[PDB]
Amino acid sequence: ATILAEQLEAFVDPILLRPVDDLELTVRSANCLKAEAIHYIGDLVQRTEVELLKTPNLGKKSLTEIKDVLASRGLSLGMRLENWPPASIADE
Amino acid sequence: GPEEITADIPNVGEAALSKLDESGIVYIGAEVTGGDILVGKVTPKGETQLTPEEKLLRAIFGEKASDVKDSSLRVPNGVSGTVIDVQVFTRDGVEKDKRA
Amino acid sequence: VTEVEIDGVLHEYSTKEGVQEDILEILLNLKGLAVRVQGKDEVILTLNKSGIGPVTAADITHDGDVEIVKPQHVICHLTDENASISMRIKVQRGRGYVPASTRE
Amino acid sequence: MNKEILAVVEAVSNEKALPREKIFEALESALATATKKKYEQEIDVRVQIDRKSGDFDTFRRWLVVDEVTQPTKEITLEAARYEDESLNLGDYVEDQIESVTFDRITTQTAKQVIVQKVREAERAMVVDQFREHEGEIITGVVKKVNRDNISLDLGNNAEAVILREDMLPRENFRPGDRVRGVLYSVRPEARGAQLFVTRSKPEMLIELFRIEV
């Protein structure tokens, strides 16, 4: 093996991060939140439900759809973010 | 009652009908393995008589005149393939489903 | 090459309207494609061609590192005025012979 | 409001004295169980019992607390400030809904889960029946012979288990014989109330002589 080697050394939250339109509900339930220039459900969780109820852009059926979405407790739980990002949501 | 050719059957898994459409018949082009489901088929079971504990199930679910087992067509154990052509023939009078 | 996705083709045993070879023969002619890649593991090449005549191997929209070494290689023959193929080709590195049955 | 459940409520051969409404909830979650597997968790036994309705739509809950345990059923007062502090401490305020699990299919599995729920209700009823007496000098007839255990069959579809440790050493019993003793198990047993008699205790023959003289 020494001879043959020397013969070769000259070669070698996921619901909040998802969009409102990605929700299982209809497009109207997403558009009710999207009328306030919201694209992510994290923006919906950043605002209170009372603040959304004080705007007539949401409808009566949209309130029931929002309740059905909040029944999973992933969104609209009355939270407050920095702007968008949590610590797990970090830039890398 | 008759047999159900629809996908709506029990004892299944995401691996039980992840290649079937909304009406039981496998797609044209779905490359299957040995032992998947091509046509989902459920048949009737026992009749006997209406029991005391099943007296409420005698008529409270539309099509509750039949029971439900499992007799779906499967690829015989060993062969792979790619489904290239599906024929559906219907005896006249029977309701055509959405894929027919 | 590993994967091909012709646009209007479900399974490899079908036929596309307006090309005088089957989809299986197009897969063999793409299997014989002689291509160099430079700085990637795998890469996705794009092919678009419309009009009467051959679809040579020089009709692939080349990326910034993929280099075809024989551009006269025929794939298929389009045979009508409005009948066009549009496919995505997946070309990757490897070693030996890796068939389809082992590894969609 | 098809009124099928209304007349399905009043069957009522065996669940007249049993909790009717609870059996609808039972059967409704059983129609909702069977082929559910996605959603977020499972279903919900709790559901707005609307007698009139009949097919009570499985509603969810939010349970107002001051704690962070049971994530899909958790409120606080600070979250109740968006509702203008209308929520109080400890309430079970429902703020969500659920649907059904289907078709052709999923409904003999729903029949199967309807049966499962009926069985659970029957077990509860049997427990209540055994609690009514709470151990007495009743007899019975052997039917099955298990390892170090004797199965007895009484009246009104009732079964009792005879421990071999509470039995006589030489005196061996078999099927077809009739034995009598005092039970001492009707509370916590196993999926109901396993009637456990003891034909070896003194109080066992306390009324045995009383039955004669």
Whether residue C103 lies within 8 A of chain B, CB to CB, comes out as: no
Instruction: Tell the residue number behind the tokens 């039917």, with chain if given.
Output: D143
Tell me: do D87 and D114 sit in the same domain. yes
In the chain, the amino acid numbered B75 is V
Q: Which of the listed residues D102, D128, D154 is the one where a domain comes to its end?
A: D128
| Number of residues that this document lists for chain B | 100
Closest CA to D158 of D196, D115, D195, D132: D195
In total, how many domains does chain B have? 1
* Residue in chain A nearest D71 by alpha carbon: A73
In the complex, which subunits touch C with 3 or more CB pairs below 8 angstroms?
Answer: B
Chain CA centroid to CA B56, Å: 25
Going from the C-alpha of D88 to that of each of A50, A51, C5, D76, the distances in angstroms are: 17, 21, 60, 9
Closest CA to C44 of C65, C23, C73: C65
Residue D85 has which token pair? 């502090």
In the chain, the amino acid numbered C72 is Q
Instruction: Tell the residue number behind the tokens 């048949």, with chain if given.
Output: B43
Which residues does D40 contact at the CB level (< 8 Å), separation at least 6? Answer: A72, A74, D72
Whether residue D60 lies within 8 A of chain A, CB to CB, comes out as: yes
Is the residue at B89 inside a domain?
yes
Tell me: do D123 and D18 sit in the same domain. yes
Tell me: do D34 and D112 sit in the same domain. yes
Tell me: do D31 and D108 sit in the same domain. yes
In total, how many domains does chain D have? 2
Find out whether D118 and D26 touch, Cβ atoms under 8 Å.
Answer: yes
Residues of A in contact with D46 (CB under 8 A): none
Domain that holds residue D97: 4-128
Residue B88 has which token pair? 């559906």
Q: CATH no. for residue B76?
A: 2.40.50.150
Residue C54 has which token pair? 């051959």
**Diameter over CA atoms, chain C:** 41
Q: Name the A residues in 46-65 with CB < 8 Å from any D CB.
A: 48-51, 64
Chain CA centroid to CA B88, Å: 14
**Backbone dihedral angles phi then psi of residue C5, each to the nearest 5 degrees:** -130, 90
For D210, the 3-state DSSP assignment is helix
In the complex, which subunits touch D with 3 or more CB pairs below 8 angstroms?
Answer: A, B
Tell me: do D16 and D75 sit in the same domain. yes
Mutation for A interface: D62, D93, D94, D95, most A CBs within 10 A: D95
- The end-to-end CA distance of chain C, in Å, is 14
Residue D29 has which token pair? 């979650």
Strand order in the sheet with C84-92: C3-6, C84-92, C42-50, C60-61
Q: What is the CATH number of domain C1-104?
A: 2.170.120.12
Residue B93 has which token pair? 């009078």
Burial class for D27, CB neighbours closer than 10 Å (0-12, 13-18, 19+)? buried
Q: Do chains C and B touch (3 or more CB pairs under 8 A)?
A: yes
Q: CATH no. for residue D101?
A: 3.30.1480.10
Run of H or E including A67: helix A60-70
Partner residue facing B57 (CB), from D5, D34, D114 = D114
DSSP secondary structure letter of residue C58: G
Tell me: do D84 and D115 sit in the same domain. yes
In the chain, the amino acid numbered C50 is S
Write the DSSP string, A26-52. -HHHHHHHHTTS--BHHHHHHS-HHHH
Burial class for D44, CB neighbours closer than 10 Å (0-12, 13-18, 19+)? buried
Judged by CB atoms closer than 8 Å, whether chains meet at A68 and D72 is answered as no
- In this structure, are strands D195-198 and D159-163 parallel, antiparallel, or unpaired? parallel
Tell me: do D39 and D54 sit in the same domain. yes
Residues of D in contact with B57 (CB under 8 A): 111, 114
Whether residue B46 lies within 8 A of chain D, CB to CB, comes out as: no
In the chain, the amino acid numbered C32 is G
* Residue in chain C nearest B30 by alpha carbon: C11
Report the distance separating Cα A34 and Cα D57, nearest Å: 29
CA dihedral B6, B9, B12, B16 (to 10 degrees): -10
Method: cryo-EM
Closest CA to D43 of D56, D54, D32, D31: D32
Neighbours of A66 (CB within 10 A): 22
Whether residue B61 lies within 8 A of chain D, CB to CB, comes out as: yes
Domain that holds residue B64: 1-94
Residues of C in contact with B80 (CB under 8 A): 101
Mutation for A interface: D39, D60, D65, most A CBs within 10 A: D60
**Alpha-helix runs per DSSP H in chain D:** 4-9, 20-33, 106-133, 208-212
